[PDB]
Amino acid sequence: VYSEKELGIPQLNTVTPVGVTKPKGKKKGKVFVDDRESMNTILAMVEAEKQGQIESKIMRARQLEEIREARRIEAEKKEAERKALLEN
Amino acid sequence: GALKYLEELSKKKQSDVVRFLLRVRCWEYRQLNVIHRASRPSRPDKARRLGYKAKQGYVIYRVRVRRGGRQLKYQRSLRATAEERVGRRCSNLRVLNSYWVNQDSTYKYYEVILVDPNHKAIRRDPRINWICNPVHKHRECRGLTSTGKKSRGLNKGHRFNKTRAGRRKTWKRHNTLSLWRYR
Amino acid sequence: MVKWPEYIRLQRQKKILRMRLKVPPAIAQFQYTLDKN
Amino acid sequence: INNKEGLLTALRRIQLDINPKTTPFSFHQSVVASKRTEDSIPQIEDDLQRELAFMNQALEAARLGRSLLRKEGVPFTRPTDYFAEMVRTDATMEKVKQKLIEEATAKKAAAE
Amino acid sequence: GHKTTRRVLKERPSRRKGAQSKRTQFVRSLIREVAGLAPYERRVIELLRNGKDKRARKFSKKKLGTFGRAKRKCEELQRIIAESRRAH
Amino acid sequence: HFRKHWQRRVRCHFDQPGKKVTRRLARRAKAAALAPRPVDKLRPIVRCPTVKYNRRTRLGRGFTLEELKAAGIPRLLAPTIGIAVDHRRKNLSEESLAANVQRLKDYKARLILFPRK
Amino acid sequence: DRSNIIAERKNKQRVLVLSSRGVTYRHRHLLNDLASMLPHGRKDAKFDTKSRLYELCELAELYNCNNVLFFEARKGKDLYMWFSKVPNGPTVKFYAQNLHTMEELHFQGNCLKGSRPILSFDAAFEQEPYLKVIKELFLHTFGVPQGHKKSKPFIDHVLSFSVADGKIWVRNYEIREVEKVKTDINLIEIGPRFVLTPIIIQEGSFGGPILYENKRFISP
Amino acid sequence: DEIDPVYDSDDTDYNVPVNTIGNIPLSFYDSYPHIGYDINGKKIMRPATGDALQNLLDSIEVPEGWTGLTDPNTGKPLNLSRDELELIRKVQQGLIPDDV
RNA sequence: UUGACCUCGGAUCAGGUAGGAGGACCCGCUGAACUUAAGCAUAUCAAUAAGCGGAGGAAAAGAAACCAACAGGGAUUGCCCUAGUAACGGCGAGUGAAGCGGCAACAGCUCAAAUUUGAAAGCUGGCUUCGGCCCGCGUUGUAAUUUGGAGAGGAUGCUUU
RNA sequence: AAGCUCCUUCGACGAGUCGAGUAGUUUGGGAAUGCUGCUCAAAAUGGGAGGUAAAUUUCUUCUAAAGCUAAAUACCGGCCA
């Protein structure tokens, strides 16, 4: 038994797509984000992770939609930053 | 030639006249006993084709058998279970053959032809006196009827290699170490 | 009330079923026999 | 027998017009190769050189099609946000993975 | 292979061991008219009068099981509709 | 292949001379009942089927109905005078027919037939 | 408009895939693999071999398909692939060989089911006459037309056709994009590994006079 | 006559979903506001957000067409129509499968 | 009111039959695990053992919906080789036939589907001096003829009891 | 009573069976190797099984869903030797 990260396993094209695979070690990059209101929803997400899944289907769907609205807000800020970079 | 007409009508058994008869008979057979007796065959053309005659010593019995699985499947057919239940009831008679007569969602209905080996009309007739011999005791229990010959794979060809003489006899032949004198 | 024998009830219920169920014309023509004369 | 005229008259009965000036690449998505790929394979029994030749022929087809498809403007790259049916089920994609896990863990245990 | 002179043979009396007699065609046609139709055959009849030959043929495939049996049943039922209006 | 219980299904053949003398006494008892008659029946000359054995003939099961008719031997008398009949086999060639008809005429020449009662 | 093609000019193409009566599990898997890559086709099985080859024409007319891909098995061991255009178009016989399907775990590639292919052909496909009418048939059969409502939008696989000796070699690959160093492409193989030797070409739909014969075919 | 390659009224693939979604489980597109993509490649979004009081009333008294199934086309749960519910009843009872 | 025919029952009515034993061999149903792969689960063990049902001196199978591709063979069964071949498989362990050929022995038949219709010609009883009387079964079919490498019907002239 | 011969006369051949789909079991054998249950359910120059790239399924070979039948075969039991 060994860790999968240590094994050089190629990425497989499942129902979840591979996207564009980045080379390992050679110019591997990452991203950057802090936020104010979306990170407030990450607070709302983590007690929901800590206190477990909600037995109420209404409250579980309501808290998932709040994270969806946070992703929609975070995405709209990202295209706004892309438009600002195109203007500059 | 009334039985040629019956043969063509029995082929067409989902049609309106026959499905009506199969509906009203199934209601009647349901409220009778399981292993009750029939004075005359319900399908006289199938009884005739299978060996029934209007002679003293030939009787007809009707059996209801429960349908479904045993996902294990009972390798015995429902006809073979039907034939075994008449012989345990009419232990003095010999099971000649059987045929289908009716169907339901819970039961299947079969009619079984029995021959009395102790009547004098039977022993006098050389077309049916073979069943008087003691080798033919309880043919339905040994798989010797038409259902049993089917389920034992008693056909000829490359397709029936393992079961054309009996699988247990063939397995004994194929697993026997034959050692000769001057090896 | 009183209990009828089983075969008496079965042959009587075969009457009612024959007159209630609607019969295909192959069997329905047997319900029309000829007259006394 | 090779009735070369007969193949020609039969062909023009079937043919849909595939001209890059008149019909876009979105219609056919078919690319012929410059090389005939018989020159790439010296020996048929040579397995690795044979698969490399077929890889290389679809390599230029994948590159030449991508340039023609990006210009025309239809999408080419499947988004990370998109999920749909797959030609192999997820179960088939799993035991593909532990085929390479036991092959990777065998060579690490062999080194260890 | 080897050159042997061939013989003609007497006609097999097991040839066409079904029933091609003119009498057995009378029995089959008379029983059908007395018996009527199955419920599935009634649906194929109704589609054939309406003109939906393709739907009747596909329905016969799903019910009987093979395409050649679908051709046979639809041919027999189309000849029933033809002989029905001849009497009409 | 000693994977199963070979010990409980091993057959030895110490009765091979015992079966031989029993076999000879069965042939002896067969000619005791059929005293002037032979112990076997006439079988036709038949060509082996596959291309490996095309060039060798053997003894078959019985004579064709056409082979009995050409030799002048009746079909319902042939089993009673020691000739095997096979209705399944066909001639399909004149060489198979001529070889077996000649065999039946040779049997006819060597035959002594006795008159009923 | 019941074509289910939302497009400017329509490529109205339907195919019908059939396995005859003796197809093995290997042949049946290849028919299931090919039909998973054609959203414009429908499946059928158990076609009576004692029937006539032009009753295949009646079959596809009934099901409204203008192409047929017929799998004929001999002895339960030998696969013969038929391509035709159903009313009048030419017909090609093939002999399938060296079959490999998706259930083998060594393939390690995957593509969107029903997505539109990149058909890759050969130079020898373009010059030579009998292969050139064959290329018309594969383009019609393996086409996946433009506006087909069962076709996935994003295009991620290449269908490869090539000649080596006298045989057509069919390969399927997955388009995968990576980032370069300081997007370049690479293909990973998916499935239907099979070899098609052209047997004989008919002018008719499933009959008609005979146009191409291969005088190099050694039958199994 | 050339075959006109149209889809018949009885064909299995006569009407297709717009969402280009097959037998894929609908556990995906739960954390994502959208649901599926269409043939041209542009995006299909969830229609709306259900009310808490409406969901509470649905839990107390379920509708006639409720099945507990998430629609592959819309994020709202799929509800059977009146004609679909009548078709299920006629299939189950079997008294009149086909009208007129 | 009488008398059927059909169906269902009773009788310490007459005449019979089945149970249980044995089970070495035979026909079916049902059905393990230990072991092996120096661990082990697919597999194997094994279509075995234990359990149930059923026969005879043998049983079973059996007169092709056969094998074949040949110049064809010709019911079944068993021996010799085929052959550790074909075929299947954690392709490892392994599993594993058959046609042909040489022998042993050989044997073929009965129905249903036909109108005897110029004559139910068939059969069980129980009463007898026994030589032949009734009763019943049966036309919703008991005899004769016929069973597809056939056959029937007329004619025909020999040959058989 | 019977065998044949001839012919301006006839010749009936087995259905909830086959088959299509599915689940189980079994086999060297997913042309499903056989068998069983379940859903649907046939034909009459028909049906079954094979051969064949040979140009269309050409040809070969039998006739399932009724039945009987000695011998060659087996035998730690039975009557003996």
PDB file of all heavy atoms in Angstrom, chain J residues 65-74:
ATOM      1  P     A J  65     -40.409 -35.428 -30.598  1.00  0.00           P
ATOM      2  OP1   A J  65     -40.259 -36.798 -30.057  1.00  0.00           O
ATOM      3  OP2   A J  65     -41.605 -35.096 -31.398  1.00  0.00           O
ATOM      4  O5'   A J  65     -40.283 -34.406 -29.385  1.00  0.00           O
ATOM      5  C5'   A J  65     -41.281 -34.336 -28.389  1.00  0.00           C
ATOM      6  C4'   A J  65     -41.808 -32.936 -28.224  1.00  0.00           C
ATOM      7  O4'   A J  65     -41.393 -32.106 -29.333  1.00  0.00           O
ATOM      8  C3'   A J  65     -43.318 -32.793 -28.208  1.00  0.00           C
ATOM      9  O3'   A J  65     -43.872 -33.120 -26.948  1.00  0.00           O
ATOM     10  C2'   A J  65     -43.514 -31.332 -28.589  1.00  0.00           C
ATOM     11  O2'   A J  65     -43.304 -30.496 -27.465  1.00  0.00           O
ATOM     12  C1'   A J  65     -42.363 -31.111 -29.574  1.00  0.00           C
ATOM     13  N9    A J  65     -42.796 -31.195 -30.981  1.00  0.00           N
ATOM     14  C8    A J  65     -42.711 -32.271 -31.816  1.00  0.00           C
ATOM     15  N7    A J  65     -43.172 -32.052 -33.018  1.00  0.00           N
ATOM     16  C5    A J  65     -43.589 -30.736 -32.972  1.00  0.00           C
ATOM     17  C6    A J  65     -44.173 -29.898 -33.932  1.00  0.00           C
ATOM     18  N6    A J  65     -44.454 -30.278 -35.178  1.00  0.00           N
ATOM     19  N1    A J  65     -44.464 -28.637 -33.567  1.00  0.00           N
ATOM     20  C2    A J  65     -44.187 -28.250 -32.320  1.00  0.00           C
ATOM     21  N3    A J  65     -43.639 -28.946 -31.330  1.00  0.00           N
ATOM     22  C4    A J  65     -43.361 -30.194 -31.726  1.00  0.00           C
ATOM     23  P     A J  66     -44.926 -34.319 -26.797  1.00  0.00           P
ATOM     24  OP1   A J  66     -46.278 -33.773 -27.057  1.00  0.00           O
ATOM     25  OP2   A J  66     -44.643 -34.996 -25.510  1.00  0.00           O
ATOM     26  O5'   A J  66     -44.564 -35.328 -27.973  1.00  0.00           O
ATOM     27  C5'   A J  66     -43.961 -36.581 -27.695  1.00  0.00           C
ATOM     28  C4'   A J  66     -44.985 -37.669 -27.511  1.00  0.00           C
ATOM     29  O4'   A J  66     -45.718 -37.868 -28.746  1.00  0.00           O
ATOM     30  C3'   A J  66     -44.430 -39.044 -27.187  1.00  0.00           C
ATOM     31  O3'   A J  66     -44.090 -39.201 -25.821  1.00  0.00           O
ATOM     32  C2'   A J  66     -45.548 -39.960 -27.651  1.00  0.00           C
ATOM     33  O2'   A J  66     -46.619 -39.952 -26.721  1.00  0.00           O
ATOM     34  C1'   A J  66     -46.007 -39.239 -28.915  1.00  0.00           C
ATOM     35  N9    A J  66     -45.280 -39.709 -30.107  1.00  0.00           N
ATOM     36  C8    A J  66     -44.441 -38.970 -30.893  1.00  0.00           C
ATOM     37  N7    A J  66     -43.927 -39.637 -31.891  1.00  0.00           N
ATOM     38  C5    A J  66     -44.455 -40.905 -31.747  1.00  0.00           C
ATOM     39  C6    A J  66     -44.294 -42.081 -32.494  1.00  0.00           C
ATOM     40  N6    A J  66     -43.526 -42.165 -33.577  1.00  0.00           N
ATOM     41  N1    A J  66     -44.965 -43.181 -32.096  1.00  0.00           N
ATOM     42  C2    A J  66     -45.741 -43.089 -31.014  1.00  0.00           C
ATOM     43  N3    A J  66     -45.971 -42.042 -30.235  1.00  0.00           N
ATOM     44  C4    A J  66     -45.295 -40.966 -30.659  1.00  0.00           C
ATOM     45  P     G J  67     -42.698 -39.888 -25.412  1.00  0.00           P
ATOM     46  OP1   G J  67     -42.525 -39.728 -23.949  1.00  0.00           O
ATOM     47  OP2   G J  67     -41.640 -39.409 -26.329  1.00  0.00           O
ATOM     48  O5'   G J  67     -42.934 -41.433 -25.699  1.00  0.00           O
ATOM     49  C5'   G J  67     -44.013 -42.119 -25.090  1.00  0.00           C
ATOM     50  C4'   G J  67     -44.257 -43.468 -25.711  1.00  0.00           C
ATOM     51  O4'   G J  67     -44.637 -43.338 -27.105  1.00  0.00           O
ATOM     52  C3'   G J  67     -43.081 -44.418 -25.764  1.00  0.00           C
ATOM     53  O3'   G J  67     -42.758 -45.006 -24.522  1.00  0.00           O
ATOM     54  C2'   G J  67     -43.538 -45.414 -26.810  1.00  0.00           C
ATOM     55  O2'   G J  67     -44.532 -46.275 -26.278  1.00  0.00           O
ATOM     56  C1'   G J  67     -44.205 -44.482 -27.817  1.00  0.00           C
ATOM     57  N9    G J  67     -43.254 -44.078 -28.871  1.00  0.00           N
ATOM     58  C8    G J  67     -42.663 -42.865 -29.097  1.00  0.00           C
ATOM     59  N7    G J  67     -41.854 -42.874 -30.124  1.00  0.00           N
ATOM     60  C5    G J  67     -41.909 -44.173 -30.604  1.00  0.00           C
ATOM     61  C6    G J  67     -41.257 -44.811 -31.696  1.00  0.00           C
ATOM     62  O6    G J  67     -40.459 -44.359 -32.523  1.00  0.00           O
ATOM     63  N1    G J  67     -41.624 -46.145 -31.799  1.00  0.00           N
ATOM     64  C2    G J  67     -42.494 -46.780 -30.962  1.00  0.00           C
ATOM     65  N2    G J  67     -42.756 -48.068 -31.182  1.00  0.00           N
ATOM     66  N3    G J  67     -43.098 -46.207 -29.960  1.00  0.00           N
ATOM     67  C4    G J  67     -42.769 -44.915 -29.837  1.00  0.00           C
ATOM     68  P     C J  68     -41.253 -45.480 -24.252  1.00  0.00           P
ATOM     69  OP1   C J  68     -41.032 -45.527 -22.789  1.00  0.00           O
ATOM     70  OP2   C J  68     -40.360 -44.659 -25.103  1.00  0.00           O
ATOM     71  O5'   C J  68     -41.220 -46.969 -24.803  1.00  0.00           O
ATOM     72  C5'   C J  68     -42.225 -47.892 -24.425  1.00  0.00           C
ATOM     73  C4'   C J  68     -42.228 -49.123 -25.295  1.00  0.00           C
ATOM     74  O4'   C J  68     -42.383 -48.749 -26.683  1.00  0.00           O
ATOM     75  C3'   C J  68     -40.968 -49.970 -25.278  1.00  0.00           C
ATOM     76  O3'   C J  68     -40.919 -50.839 -24.162  1.00  0.00           O
ATOM     77  C2'   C J  68     -41.052 -50.713 -26.600  1.00  0.00           C
ATOM     78  O2'   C J  68     -41.925 -51.826 -26.493  1.00  0.00           O
ATOM     79  C1'   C J  68     -41.713 -49.674 -27.505  1.00  0.00           C
ATOM     80  N1    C J  68     -40.756 -48.942 -28.366  1.00  0.00           N
ATOM     81  C2    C J  68     -40.131 -49.586 -29.439  1.00  0.00           C
ATOM     82  O2    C J  68     -40.363 -50.782 -29.662  1.00  0.00           O
ATOM     83  N3    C J  68     -39.282 -48.886 -30.212  1.00  0.00           N
ATOM     84  C4    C J  68     -39.054 -47.600 -29.960  1.00  0.00           C
ATOM     85  N4    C J  68     -38.202 -46.959 -30.757  1.00  0.00           N
ATOM     86  C5    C J  68     -39.682 -46.915 -28.887  1.00  0.00           C
ATOM     87  C6    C J  68     -40.519 -47.619 -28.129  1.00  0.00           C
ATOM     88  P     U J  69     -39.520 -51.222 -23.481  1.00  0.00           P
ATOM     89  OP1   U J  69     -39.790 -52.226 -22.431  1.00  0.00           O
ATOM     90  OP2   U J  69     -38.820 -49.968 -23.129  1.00  0.00           O
ATOM     91  O5'   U J  69     -38.702 -51.956 -24.631  1.00  0.00           O
ATOM     92  C5'   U J  69     -39.019 -53.284 -25.016  1.00  0.00           C
ATOM     93  C4'   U J  69     -38.246 -53.711 -26.240  1.00  0.00           C
ATOM     94  O4'   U J  69     -38.445 -52.761 -27.312  1.00  0.00           O
ATOM     95  C3'   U J  69     -36.739 -53.792 -26.087  1.00  0.00           C
ATOM     96  O3'   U J  69     -36.333 -55.018 -25.512  1.00  0.00           O
ATOM     97  C2'   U J  69     -36.240 -53.633 -27.518  1.00  0.00           C
ATOM     98  O2'   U J  69     -36.265 -54.877 -28.199  1.00  0.00           O
ATOM     99  C1'   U J  69     -37.303 -52.723 -28.136  1.00  0.00           C
ATOM    100  N1    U J  69     -36.858 -51.321 -28.291  1.00  0.00           N
ATOM    101  C2    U J  69     -35.990 -51.011 -29.322  1.00  0.00           C
ATOM    102  O2    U J  69     -35.548 -51.824 -30.116  1.00  0.00           O
ATOM    103  N3    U J  69     -35.636 -49.694 -29.402  1.00  0.00           N
ATOM    104  C4    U J  69     -36.056 -48.672 -28.586  1.00  0.00           C
ATOM    105  O4    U J  69     -35.645 -47.531 -28.788  1.00  0.00           O
ATOM    106  C5    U J  69     -36.956 -49.069 -27.553  1.00  0.00           C
ATOM    107  C6    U J  69     -37.315 -50.347 -27.447  1.00  0.00           C
ATOM    108  P     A J  70     -35.776 -55.088 -24.010  1.00  0.00           P
ATOM    109  OP1   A J  70     -36.927 -54.993 -23.085  1.00  0.00           O
ATOM    110  OP2   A J  70     -34.642 -54.145 -23.886  1.00  0.00           O
ATOM    111  O5'   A J  70     -35.197 -56.563 -23.898  1.00  0.00           O
ATOM    112  C5'   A J  70     -33.802 -56.787 -23.791  1.00  0.00           C
ATOM    113  C4'   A J  70     -33.348 -57.904 -24.695  1.00  0.00           C
ATOM    114  O4'   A J  70     -33.752 -57.625 -26.051  1.00  0.00           O
ATOM    115  C3'   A J  70     -31.845 -58.109 -24.781  1.00  0.00           C
ATOM    116  O3'   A J  70     -31.371 -58.932 -23.734  1.00  0.00           O
ATOM    117  C2'   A J  70     -31.646 -58.735 -26.157  1.00  0.00           C
ATOM    118  O2'   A J  70     -31.801 -60.144 -26.093  1.00  0.00           O
ATOM    119  C1'   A J  70     -32.815 -58.160 -26.953  1.00  0.00           C
ATOM    120  N9    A J  70     -32.445 -57.124 -27.938  1.00  0.00           N
ATOM    121  C8    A J  70     -32.989 -55.872 -28.017  1.00  0.00           C
ATOM    122  N7    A J  70     -32.535 -55.150 -29.006  1.00  0.00           N
ATOM    123  C5    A J  70     -31.642 -55.995 -29.641  1.00  0.00           C
ATOM    124  C6    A J  70     -30.827 -55.820 -30.767  1.00  0.00           C
ATOM    125  N6    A J  70     -30.780 -54.696 -31.478  1.00  0.00           N
ATOM    126  N1    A J  70     -30.050 -56.847 -31.150  1.00  0.00           N
ATOM    127  C2    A J  70     -30.094 -57.977 -30.441  1.00  0.00           C
ATOM    128  N3    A J  70     -30.820 -58.262 -29.365  1.00  0.00           N
ATOM    129  C4    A J  70     -31.583 -57.218 -29.006  1.00  0.00           C
ATOM    130  P     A J  71     -30.018 -58.568 -22.967  1.00  0.00           P
ATOM    131  OP1   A J  71     -29.789 -59.591 -21.919  1.00  0.00           O
ATOM    132  OP2   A J  71     -30.089 -57.135 -22.605  1.00  0.00           O
ATOM    133  O5'   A J  71     -28.892 -58.742 -24.077  1.00  0.00           O
ATOM    134  C5'   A J  71     -28.526 -60.023 -24.564  1.00  0.00           C
ATOM    135  C4'   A J  71     -27.440 -59.907 -25.602  1.00  0.00           C
ATOM    136  O4'   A J  71     -27.984 -59.308 -26.796  1.00  0.00           O
ATOM    137  C3'   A J  71     -26.273 -59.015 -25.215  1.00  0.00           C
ATOM    138  O3'   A J  71     -25.282 -59.744 -24.519  1.00  0.00           O
ATOM    139  C2'   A J  71     -25.775 -58.468 -26.547  1.00  0.00           C
ATOM    140  O2'   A J  71     -24.873 -59.379 -27.156  1.00  0.00           O
ATOM    141  C1'   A J  71     -27.051 -58.434 -27.381  1.00  0.00           C
ATOM    142  N9    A J  71     -27.684 -57.111 -27.486  1.00  0.00           N
ATOM    143  C8    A J  71     -28.593 -56.555 -26.628  1.00  0.00           C
ATOM    144  N7    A J  71     -29.032 -55.385 -27.007  1.00  0.00           N
ATOM    145  C5    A J  71     -28.385 -55.169 -28.208  1.00  0.00           C
ATOM    146  C6    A J  71     -28.423 -54.106 -29.117  1.00  0.00           C
ATOM    147  N6    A J  71     -29.173 -53.021 -28.942  1.00  0.00           N
ATOM    148  N1    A J  71     -27.658 -54.192 -30.224  1.00  0.00           N
ATOM    149  C2    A J  71     -26.910 -55.282 -30.398  1.00  0.00           C
ATOM    150  N3    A J  71     -26.791 -56.346 -29.612  1.00  0.00           N
ATOM    151  C4    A J  71     -27.562 -56.226 -28.522  1.00  0.00           C
ATOM    152  P     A J  72     -24.634 -59.169 -23.176  1.00  0.00           P
ATOM    153  OP1   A J  72     -24.265 -60.332 -22.335  1.00  0.00           O
ATOM    154  OP2   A J  72     -25.547 -58.133 -22.635  1.00  0.00           O
ATOM    155  O5'   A J  72     -23.298 -58.468 -23.672  1.00  0.00           O
ATOM    156  C5'   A J  72     -22.329 -59.195 -24.410  1.00  0.00           C
ATOM    157  C4'   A J  72     -21.614 -58.309 -25.394  1.00  0.00           C
ATOM    158  O4'   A J  72     -22.565 -57.812 -26.364  1.00  0.00           O
ATOM    159  C3'   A J  72     -20.974 -57.055 -24.822  1.00  0.00           C
ATOM    160  O3'   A J  72     -19.696 -57.304 -24.256  1.00  0.00           O
ATOM    161  C2'   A J  72     -20.930 -56.123 -26.028  1.00  0.00           C
ATOM    162  O2'   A J  72     -19.814 -56.422 -26.851  1.00  0.00           O
ATOM    163  C1'   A J  72     -22.204 -56.518 -26.778  1.00  0.00           C
ATOM    164  N9    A J  72     -23.324 -55.598 -26.509  1.00  0.00           N
ATOM    165  C8    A J  72     -24.084 -55.511 -25.377  1.00  0.00           C
ATOM    166  N7    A J  72     -25.003 -54.584 -25.427  1.00  0.00           N
ATOM    167  C5    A J  72     -24.834 -54.016 -26.676  1.00  0.00           C
ATOM    168  C6    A J  72     -25.498 -52.978 -27.345  1.00  0.00           C
ATOM    169  N6    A J  72     -26.512 -52.297 -26.817  1.00  0.00           N
ATOM    170  N1    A J  72     -25.093 -52.648 -28.586  1.00  0.00           N
ATOM    171  C2    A J  72     -24.077 -53.329 -29.116  1.00  0.00           C
ATOM    172  N3    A J  72     -23.377 -54.328 -28.585  1.00  0.00           N
ATOM    173  C4    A J  72     -23.804 -54.625 -27.349  1.00  0.00           C
ATOM    174  P     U J  73     -19.464 -57.257 -22.665  1.00  0.00           P
ATOM    175  OP1   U J  73     -18.012 -57.371 -22.403  1.00  0.00           O
ATOM    176  OP2   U J  73     -20.390 -58.214 -22.024  1.00  0.00           O
ATOM    177  O5'   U J  73     -19.911 -55.793 -22.244  1.00  0.00           O
ATOM    178  C5'   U J  73     -19.110 -54.661 -22.536  1.00  0.00           C
ATOM    179  C4'   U J  73     -19.593 -53.454 -21.776  1.00  0.00           C
ATOM    180  O4'   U J  73     -20.980 -53.194 -22.121  1.00  0.00           O
ATOM    181  C3'   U J  73     -19.611 -53.598 -20.264  1.00  0.00           C
ATOM    182  O3'   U J  73     -18.353 -53.356 -19.666  1.00  0.00           O
ATOM    183  C2'   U J  73     -20.678 -52.604 -19.848  1.00  0.00           C
ATOM    184  O2'   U J  73     -20.169 -51.281 -19.887  1.00  0.00           O
ATOM    185  C1'   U J  73     -21.689 -52.762 -20.981  1.00  0.00           C
ATOM    186  N1    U J  73     -22.742 -53.762 -20.678  1.00  0.00           N
ATOM    187  C2    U J  73     -23.694 -53.498 -19.713  1.00  0.00           C
ATOM    188  O2    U J  73     -23.750 -52.477 -19.053  1.00  0.00           O
ATOM    189  N3    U J  73     -24.614 -54.494 -19.531  1.00  0.00           N
ATOM    190  C4    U J  73     -24.698 -55.697 -20.187  1.00  0.00           C
ATOM    191  O4    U J  73     -25.593 -56.488 -19.902  1.00  0.00           O
ATOM    192  C5    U J  73     -23.694 -55.899 -21.169  1.00  0.00           C
ATOM    193  C6    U J  73     -22.788 -54.945 -21.372  1.00  0.00           C
ATOM    194  P     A J  74     -17.870 -54.253 -18.429  1.00  0.00           P
ATOM    195  OP1   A J  74     -16.413 -54.064 -18.260  1.00  0.00           O
ATOM    196  OP2   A J  74     -18.415 -55.617 -18.606  1.00  0.00           O
ATOM    197  O5'   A J  74     -18.592 -53.606 -17.173  1.00  0.00           O
ATOM    198  C5'   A J  74     -18.418 -52.234 -16.862  1.00  0.00           C
ATOM    199  C4'   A J  74     -19.398 -51.779 -15.814  1.00  0.00           C
ATOM    200  O4'   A J  74     -20.748 -51.962 -16.297  1.00  0.00           O
ATOM    201  C3'   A J  74     -19.371 -52.541 -14.504  1.00  0.00           C
ATOM    202  O3'   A J  74     -18.347 -52.096 -13.637  1.00  0.00           O
ATOM    203  C2'   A J  74     -20.766 -52.303 -13.947  1.00  0.00           C
ATOM    204  O2'   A J  74     -20.841 -51.031 -13.323  1.00  0.00           O
ATOM    205  C1'   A J  74     -21.607 -52.258 -15.220  1.00  0.00           C
ATOM    206  N9    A J  74     -22.314 -53.521 -15.497  1.00  0.00           N
ATOM    207  C8    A J  74     -22.112 -54.362 -16.555  1.00  0.00           C
ATOM    208  N7    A J  74     -22.901 -55.404 -16.566  1.00  0.00           N
ATOM    209  C5    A J  74     -23.680 -55.235 -15.438  1.00  0.00           C
ATOM    210  C6    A J  74     -24.714 -56.004 -14.884  1.00  0.00           C
ATOM    211  N6    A J  74     -25.150 -57.141 -15.421  1.00  0.00           N
ATOM    212  N1    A J  74     -25.293 -55.561 -13.751  1.00  0.00           N
ATOM    213  C2    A J  74     -24.857 -54.420 -13.213  1.00  0.00           C
ATOM    214  N3    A J  74     -23.896 -53.611 -13.644  1.00  0.00           N
ATOM    215  C4    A J  74     -23.340 -54.078 -14.772  1.00  0.00           C
TER     216        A J  74
END
